Structure 1
Amino acid sequence: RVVFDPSNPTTFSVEAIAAYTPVALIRLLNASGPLQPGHRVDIADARSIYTVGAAASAARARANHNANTIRRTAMFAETDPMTWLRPTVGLKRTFNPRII
């Protein structure tokens, strides 16, 4: 599909797609473009798309989980302007907060 082209994903076409969906399609496609279309622009610029959009590609299949857990609190003290008369202690993340 979208491989014969100069930076079409552009850190955009990946937050629409689910995380698990594209990674299977790699071993589906065989060959790239014939005109080196999206490769005259730096290979680094191409690499500057998927690895920076994938944390949002997973953010939606993780944003469906958002309503079946408990939001974390910080792992340090993290001084607050209201901490007075109650001392802050941090929580190492161990528990299994998926609601069952």
Structure 2
Amino acid sequence: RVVFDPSNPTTFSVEAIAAYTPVALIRLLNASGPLQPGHRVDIADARSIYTVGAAASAARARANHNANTIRRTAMFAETDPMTWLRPTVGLKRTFNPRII
């Protein structure tokens, strides 16, 4: 959709897209912009938007898993304001977090 346009996605619909069909979509286009809308702009920004967009896409996509996955806890010492009267401990994230 937004390929023949100067940086017009601007990290808006890419995250509204899922984490499967966007990559299933870039593989569908068969041409680029002849007038080069999204190419006449310095491509340096034409890159730095799609990436962060897909990032937030996958982030909000997995945000649902935070309902069946544990709150990720610190794995290191990381002295605590209540580190008196008890010494902190890390936690090696070895367990399978998938609850039942």
Query: TM-score normalised to the size of structure 1?
Result: 0.91
Indicate the RMSD between aligned Cα atoms, in angstroms.
1.2
Q: Which residue of 2 aligns with 1:23?
A: 23
Tell me the alpha carbon deviations over residues 58-78 of structure 1, each in whole angstroms, 9 at most, x when there is no partner.
Answer: 012101111001111111111
Whole-Å Cα distance in 1 between the matches of residues 78 and 17 of structure 2?
A: 36
8 Å Cα contact 1:18-1:60 kept in structure 2 = no
Q: Is the 8 A contact 1:15 1:56 kept in 2?
A: yes
User: What percentage of aligned pairs have identical amino acids?
Assistant: 100
The runs of at least 4 aligned residues of structure 1 exceeding 3 Å deviation read none
Unpaired stretches in structure 2, ≥5 consecutive residues: none
Q: Does 1:76 align with 2:76?
A: yes
Partner in structure 2 of residue 55 of structure 1: 55
Task: Return the alpha-carbon distance in structure 1 between the equivalents of residues 61 and 72 of structure 2.
Answer: 18
**Structure number with higher helix proportion:** 2
Q: Does the Cα contact within 8 Å between 2:75 and 2:90 map onto a contact in 1?
A: yes
1:12 Cα shift?
2.0
Q: Is the 8 A contact 1:14 1:54 kept in 2?
A: yes
Tell me the TM-score normalized by structure 2. Answer: 0.91
- Structure 1: gaps spanning 5 or more residues: none
Matched residue pairs, number? 100
CA drift at 1:89: 1.4
